[PDB]
């Protein structure tokens, strides 16, 4: 197999970002690995969800940034207002 | 406690009296006859709209 250069033998394993793979007969076989997610609020208004999806809003209020769904788990808000 | 048919699932963390609430259209409305909003368009209860293969219905301020 090959992966950005190095010629991997048929049976050498590797650890990818969130998965680990093994070179099969010409193809890789990958098994998923746990890894967290991140939501970012940068600048005045730059929102990156846990699934990428970058966008800009420019709001003026308190907003539900992220709240647990069951009944009570938690609730993270934020104040995006003109400055 | 002042709901507006847009903060129903918000939580009301931080005019219409108890019971009746604002609908975003005008005077206060009951929860059953609360309208729906989609793409900045206000649709009354029982309205029908399709999404590319399906059909929807504004039932109680939500879409079925």
Structure tokens at A83: 């400055």
As a whole number of Å, the CA-based R_g of chain B is: 13
Interface of A with B in 42-71 (CB under 8 A): 62, 64, 67
Query: How far is the C-alpha of B37 from the C-alpha of B42, rounded, in Å?
Result: 5
Whether A75 sits inside 8 A of B10 (CB atoms) is: no
Nearest CA in chain B to A65: B10
Which residues in A lie closer than 8 A to residue B13 (C-beta atoms)? 62, 75, 77
Query: How far is the C-alpha of B56 from the C-alpha of B64, rounded, in Å?
Result: 5
Closest Cα in chain A, distance from residue B58 (Å): 23
In three state form, how does the secondary structure of chain A look?
A: CECCCCECCCCCEEECCCEEEEECCCCEEEEECCCCCCCEEECCCEEEECCEEEECCCCCEEEEEEECCCCCCCEEEEEECCC
H or E stretch covering B57: strand B54-57
Structure tokens at A35: 């890894």
Contacts of B46 (CB under 8 A, 6+ apart): B57, B58, B59
**What three-state secondary structure class fits B56?**
strand
Question: What is the DSSP annotation of B2-55?
Answer: ---SSSTTT-------SS-EE-SSSSEE-STT--EEETTEEE-TT-EEEETTEE
H or E stretch covering B60: none
Q: Is A75 on the interface with B (CB under 8 A)?
A: yes
Q: What is the resolution of this structure in A?
A: 3.4
Instruction: Check: CB of residue B58 under 8 Å from CB of residue B36.
Output: yes
């Amino acid at each position: 197999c090959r992966l950005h250069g190095h010629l991997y033998t048929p049976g050498q394993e590797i650890t990818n970002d969130c998965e680990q793979c093994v070179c099969n007969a010409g193809r890789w076989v990958c098994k998923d690995l746990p890894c967290p997610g991140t939501c970012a609020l940068e600048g005045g208004s730059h929102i990156t969800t846990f699934d990428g999806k970058t966008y800009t809003f420019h709001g003026d209020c308190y907003y539900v940034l992220a709240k647990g769904d069951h009944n009570d788990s938690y609730a993270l808000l934020g104040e995006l207002a003109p400055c | 406690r002042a709901l507006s048919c847009q903060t129903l699932a918000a939580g009301y963390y931080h005019v219409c009296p108890d019971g009746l609430m604002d609908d975003g259209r005008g005077g206060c409305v009951v929860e059953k006859e609360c309208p729906c909003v989609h793409n900045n368009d206000l649709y009354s209860s029982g309205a029908k709209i399709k999404v590319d293969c399906n059909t929807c219905t504004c039932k109680r301020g939500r879409w079925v």
